[PDB]
Design an enzyme around this catalytic site. Sequence first.
Site, short mmCIF file in Angstrom:
data_model
loop_
_atom_site.label_atom_id
_atom_site.label_comp_id
_atom_site.label_asym_id
_atom_site.label_seq_id
_atom_site.Cartn_x
_atom_site.Cartn_y
_atom_site.Cartn_z
N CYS A 66 -8.64 -4.56 -11.38
CA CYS A 66 -8.95 -3.14 -11.17
C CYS A 66 -10.31 -2.72 -11.65
O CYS A 66 -11.01 -1.96 -10.96
CB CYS A 66 -7.90 -2.27 -11.83
SG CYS A 66 -7.40 -2.76 -13.50
N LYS A 74 9.72 -0.89 -12.04
CA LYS A 74 9.66 -1.48 -10.71
C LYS A 74 8.44 -2.38 -10.65
O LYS A 74 7.31 -1.92 -10.64
CB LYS A 74 9.57 -0.39 -9.65
CG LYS A 74 10.33 -0.71 -8.36
CD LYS A 74 9.73 -1.84 -7.53
CE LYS A 74 8.37 -1.49 -6.98
NZ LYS A 74 7.85 -2.62 -6.14
N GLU A 113 -12.73 -0.67 -2.16
CA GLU A 113 -12.21 -1.69 -3.06
C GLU A 113 -11.80 -2.96 -2.29
O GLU A 113 -10.73 -3.02 -1.68
CB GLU A 113 -11.04 -1.13 -3.87
CG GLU A 113 -10.51 -2.08 -4.93
CD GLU A 113 -9.39 -1.48 -5.77
OE1 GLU A 113 -8.41 -0.96 -5.18
OE2 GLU A 113 -9.47 -1.54 -7.03
N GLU A 125 -2.82 5.02 -13.25
CA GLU A 125 -3.88 4.04 -13.47
C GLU A 125 -4.23 3.42 -12.13
O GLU A 125 -3.48 2.60 -11.65
CB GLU A 125 -3.37 2.98 -14.43
CG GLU A 125 -3.24 3.46 -15.87
CD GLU A 125 -4.55 3.45 -16.66
OE1 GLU A 125 -5.58 2.94 -16.15
OE2 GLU A 125 -4.55 3.97 -17.80
N1 LIG Z 1 -6.18 0.99 -13.56
C1 LIG Z 1 -5.45 -0.07 -13.94
O1 LIG Z 1 -5.04 -0.28 -15.10
C2 LIG Z 1 -5.08 -1.07 -12.88
C3 LIG Z 1 -4.64 -2.33 -13.28
C4 LIG Z 1 -4.26 -3.24 -12.30
C5 LIG Z 1 -4.33 -2.88 -10.95
N2 LIG Z 1 -4.75 -1.66 -10.58
C6 LIG Z 1 -4.84 -1.30 -9.15
O2 LIG Z 1 -3.72 -1.71 -8.37
C7 LIG Z 1 -4.11 -1.95 -7.00
C8 LIG Z 1 -3.59 -3.31 -6.55
O3 LIG Z 1 -2.17 -3.44 -6.72
P1 LIG Z 1 -1.17 -3.18 -5.46
O4 LIG Z 1 -1.73 -3.69 -4.20
O5 LIG Z 1 0.26 -3.83 -5.70
O6 LIG Z 1 -1.12 -1.63 -5.13
P2 LIG Z 1 0.01 -0.68 -4.57
O7 LIG Z 1 -0.42 0.76 -4.76
O8 LIG Z 1 0.13 -0.99 -3.10
O9 LIG Z 1 1.42 -1.01 -5.23
C9 LIG Z 1 1.53 -1.00 -6.66
C10 LIG Z 1 3.00 -0.91 -7.04
O10 LIG Z 1 3.54 0.29 -6.49
C11 LIG Z 1 4.56 -0.02 -5.52
N3 LIG Z 1 4.41 0.90 -4.40
C12 LIG Z 1 3.74 0.72 -3.23
N4 LIG Z 1 3.87 1.80 -2.44
C13 LIG Z 1 4.62 2.70 -3.10
C14 LIG Z 1 5.09 3.98 -2.83
N5 LIG Z 1 4.77 4.56 -1.67
N6 LIG Z 1 5.84 4.61 -3.75
C15 LIG Z 1 6.14 4.03 -4.94
N7 LIG Z 1 5.73 2.79 -5.26
C16 LIG Z 1 4.96 2.09 -4.40
C17 LIG Z 1 4.39 -1.49 -5.17
O11 LIG Z 1 5.65 -2.09 -4.83
C18 LIG Z 1 3.86 -2.02 -6.50
O12 LIG Z 1 4.95 -2.24 -7.41
C19 LIG Z 1 -5.62 -1.93 -6.97
O13 LIG Z 1 -6.10 -0.70 -6.41
C20 LIG Z 1 -5.99 -2.04 -8.45
O14 LIG Z 1 -7.27 -1.52 -8.75
C21 LIG Z 1 -5.11 -0.75 -11.51
#
Ligand SMILES: NC(=O)c1ccc[n+]([C@@H]2O[C@H](COP(=O)([O-])OP(=O)(O)OC[C@H]3O[C@@H](n4cnc5c(N)ncnc54)[C@H](O)[C@@H]3O)[C@@H](O)[C@H]2O)c1
Lengths: 493, 493
Positions: free
Chosen positions: B295, B185, B392, B261
């Site tokens: 991240c 997804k 963040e 992650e």
């Molecule tokens: N640790 C790592 O390797 C790494 C790498 C890149 C980004 N990140 C983190 O990702 C975040 C930014 O990305 P984001 O805004 O898209 O975050 P997000 O948590 O809002 O969403 C991430 C993904 O999960 C999905 N999602 C959202 N809510 C969900 C739910 N309730 N159930 C299942 N899936 C859901 C979204 O559609 C998207 O595909 C930041 O906190 C960043 O630090 C971490």
Amino acid sequence: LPSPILNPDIPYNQLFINNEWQDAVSKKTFPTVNPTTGEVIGHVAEGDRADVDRAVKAAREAFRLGSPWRRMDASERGRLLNRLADLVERDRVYLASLETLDNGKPFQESYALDLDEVIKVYRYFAGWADKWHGKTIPMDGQHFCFTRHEPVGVCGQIIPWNFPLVMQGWKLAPALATGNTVVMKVAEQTPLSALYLASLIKEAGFPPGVVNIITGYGPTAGAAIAQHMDVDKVAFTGSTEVGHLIQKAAGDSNLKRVTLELGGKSPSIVLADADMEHAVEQCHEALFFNMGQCCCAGSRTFVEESIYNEFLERTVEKAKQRKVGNPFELDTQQGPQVDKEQFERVLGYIQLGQKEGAKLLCGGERFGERGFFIKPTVFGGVQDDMRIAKEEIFGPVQPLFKFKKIEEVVERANNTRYGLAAAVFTRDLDKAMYFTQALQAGTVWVNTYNIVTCHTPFGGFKESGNGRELGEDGLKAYTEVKTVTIKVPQKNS
Amino acid sequence: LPSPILNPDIPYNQLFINNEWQDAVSKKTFPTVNPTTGEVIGHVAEGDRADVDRAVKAAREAFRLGSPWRRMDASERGRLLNRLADLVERDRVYLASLETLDNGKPFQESYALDLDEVIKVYRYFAGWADKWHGKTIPMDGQHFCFTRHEPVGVCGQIIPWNFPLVMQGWKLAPALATGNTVVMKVAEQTPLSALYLASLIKEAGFPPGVVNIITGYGPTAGAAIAQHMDVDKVAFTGSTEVGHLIQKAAGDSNLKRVTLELGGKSPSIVLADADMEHAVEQCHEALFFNMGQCCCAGSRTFVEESIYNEFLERTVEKAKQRKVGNPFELDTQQGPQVDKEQFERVLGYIQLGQKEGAKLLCGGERFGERGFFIKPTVFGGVQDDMRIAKEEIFGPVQPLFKFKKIEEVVERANNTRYGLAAAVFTRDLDKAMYFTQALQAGTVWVNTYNIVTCHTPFGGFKESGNGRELGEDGLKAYTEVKTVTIKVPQKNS
Ligand SMILES: NC(=O)c1ccc[n+]([C@@H]2O[C@H](COP(=O)([O-])OP(=O)(O)OC[C@H]3O[C@@H](n4cnc5c(N)ncnc54)[C@H](O)[C@@H]3O)[C@@H](O)[C@H]2O)c1
Ligand SMILES: NC(=O)c1ccc[n+]([C@@H]2O[C@H](COP(=O)([O-])OP(=O)(O)OC[C@H]3O[C@@H](n4cnc5c(N)ncnc54)[C@H](O)[C@@H]3O)[C@@H](O)[C@H]2O)c1
Ligand SMILES: COc1ccccc1-n1cc(-c2ccc(-c3ccccc3)cc2)[n+]2c1CCCCC2
Ligand SMILES: COc1ccccc1-n1cc(-c2ccc(-c3ccccc3)cc2)[n+]2c1CCCCC2
Ligand code: NA
Ligand code: NA
């Protein structure tokens, strides 16, 4: 072989926090019962959330950067676990007697098998302490890259009643070897042996707060550990249903790392070319070992059609011959069930099996009048849609199934939410090899059963668990990996 | 550096399921925006729960005993991943141009960094496929004992928008190397590049159902994967908040295995003996890389008192020099934020920083009046209790902190529930060694920042995650261990 201590002194019956014995905050106690006599042995401190909080603070401080336990050579952690094992071996008769008293298992089991495994697990992980290596990594760029295997931190450990000291050892040994600290919640039904073991931890010279032991109920003391914001890891052994709750609680508190060692409905599969007498003996013990209260019990025996009748007759004969009685007498093979509730639950399933259309071949009722004894019970003509075929009975009830085809029996074996273990009996190389691939279980035995030692990674596929214990692979759940990447002036191979 | 394609054809905008392009069952679609202009590029299928069930079904069939994917040589999985890498390389300009269009990152980053990493990760894990070994174990008794490294099964993979192709590769490569099947997804904000990649997966020759890509929202399509009863494993990258919900969902459904992650608030720590120009430059890029949407961004810069004024002044100048603008221009260093919501969130944090009493040193507002551009922003005199110090921001906002002692800066760096990364800049051997031990982070960089390659395990301590991705260590999350123990006639060493 040696002589049991028939009613020993039980000095330890309180919480073990920060290397000192103490009551609960509330001063409450709870009874533990001797399942052979049905009588109360004594009372034990009833730990709850505040007591857990005290143990966690103690574990947190023992883990502090610059602490004795943190500063100490990895090899000194080894020497401590090894000394602990020396002390278990010195007190082996007392501990095995205490186990039989509180749990009900035959003293021949307690002494020769359980206590043997306790000693070996502590000695085995003693050796791992200073042999657990990270990596140096030839990454791209002007970089020196390595990994450090650091401890995960404060580990909450929750164990069941069926192998009190073994289960304790499986948790403590690898956790301590990798330099963690521990808050352990032992089972309400069997608190006594773990408290005496705690006395030997102190005697061995482990610093205060490295191991803390809490007696109490699951939904109170257990749940407080799984939900605690300052516990870095939870390792849970128990039922699949409580397993779900542990994982949710990790998600709901602080994303603590989780390992789950859960229930089973493990199949024994006997092919036509098997050694008949060996397979019958092995499948019999696979089920009735520890009164059927073993998580990887061979609780479904599948037998090829052409040998079914013979196998059935011989299986019933072994059930009828199995000596049920007082576990302190040396030739006793089957002690009582652990408590009134388990007793009634196993009898409930015996009734249910009859109601469903399964043939009661032997036993099927209480043995005697005192304690929680059940006669070895065997069912024939069992169908996959029956509840006794699906649910974990956890008692001395052996259901027998009939199959005709290899492909049929793998599908039936695998058609369960469980996946802890499985076994094949066969003389054929190709069939043994096929089954080792096809069976969806964490452990597959060939021509044997219940061989789980300190060397052998153990755990479930599917809803039988998450992660592995024992072996080298068991160290990984108690390790947090750090990558260190350093800019260097130039890089050469 | 090649010319970008400014008006690419975008043929692929549907679900990818069983190697077939499909509409959502509902026929619903949703728009994706070009963040440079703020205009709709086009529409893609809005997958929901019914579509996830369809994908999981296809993944499950592809995973069945005896399927092409299960019986293929591990080396052939490798060749398939290598072939995929060749196709990415072939279409590199296109893929990087599409990434920039949909996400906003500069084409200099897209082409030369992201696409580089995508190619490398596929090639790296292509090599692991036939080199991931289990063990033979010299266990007690008359036994032959070994471990099989089996695939975990159907892996649900959920990724964010900040590095769409790279995050995809980090997930798909190790999972496929180890023989799993996938339902992925991708983020609603950046669906397009991942679909073109799926067409390459098909062209490369992966069997139908091995990789399935779902576009749609988090609480519908993503939730459906995490709660699905036939998904064996979920690997989630995203916010810490959603991470809590993933782990709960696993525990509420089928005890699927979880890797998380999650977020970060990672510190770069500059000591007084550091090379000034180098440390200033490194800390600048440590925050501003990918418009602050990283991240492991160096999102708290700690600087020793005696060099703070000079550091600050150089950091300001560097922020004022960063070229903000159209990401298709080869010298642009900062593109727009990903969408309206992220844009406004970052301006809200900029407003919040000044209300809390932090000193705005430069930027602090929108850049121009079209798209989602923000001026590079630096805050001085930031305190540990401010919201902009704890939360963040995920934008081009660099807060600076002053410290005096090593023991102080370690405590302040570590005093967060986050723990993804950290860096130290110093010339002194003993100080570097001390920080690599004391910092509670998954990755510690010394005199560099953001060096995360296919070789280097990556993941969080505390609430920044559970488990590790990349390197050898990243294979472990996609592996279910089976112990096989075989009775043998006699045992010799
Ligand atoms: N640790 C790592 O390797 C790494 C790498 C890149 C980004 N990140 C983190 O990702 C975040 C930014 O990305 P984001 O805004 O898209 O975050 P997000 O948590 O809002 O969403 C991430 C993904 O999960 C999905 N999602 C959202 N809510 C969900 C739910 N309730 N159930 C299942 N899936 C859901 C979204 O559609 C998207 O595909 C930041 O906190 C960043 O630090 C971490
Ligand atoms: N896989 C293995 O290694 C293994 C080994 C032995 C037993 N088992 C399993 O354990 C089960 C039998 O033991 P049990 O009846 O004591 O199971 P259980 O789940 O009821 O209790 C296990 C432990 O967890 C505690 N507990 C109960 N509810 C809790 C809660 N809500 N939160 C936190 N802790 C809680 C109990 O006090 C006890 O300490 C069987 O299903 C058996 O298969 C598994
Ligand atoms: C403390 O023990 C356990 C704890 C948990 C799980 C399994 C065991 N378990 C069960 C058995 C076991 C094997 C074979 C028989 C038997 C006896 C007569 C005839 C035929 C077979 C009885 C018990 N063992 C072990 C420990 C490991 C190897 C030593 C033997
Ligand atoms: C696709 O990229 C990433 C994805 C996720 C996390 C981090 C990265 N990331 C970030 C960077 C990176 C390093 C250094 C600078 C820089 C430029 C000018 C001056 C000083 C430092 C800019 C970017 N790199 C990578 C990946 C590969 C390692 C080396 C390159
Ligand atoms: Na008892
Ligand atoms: Na977009």
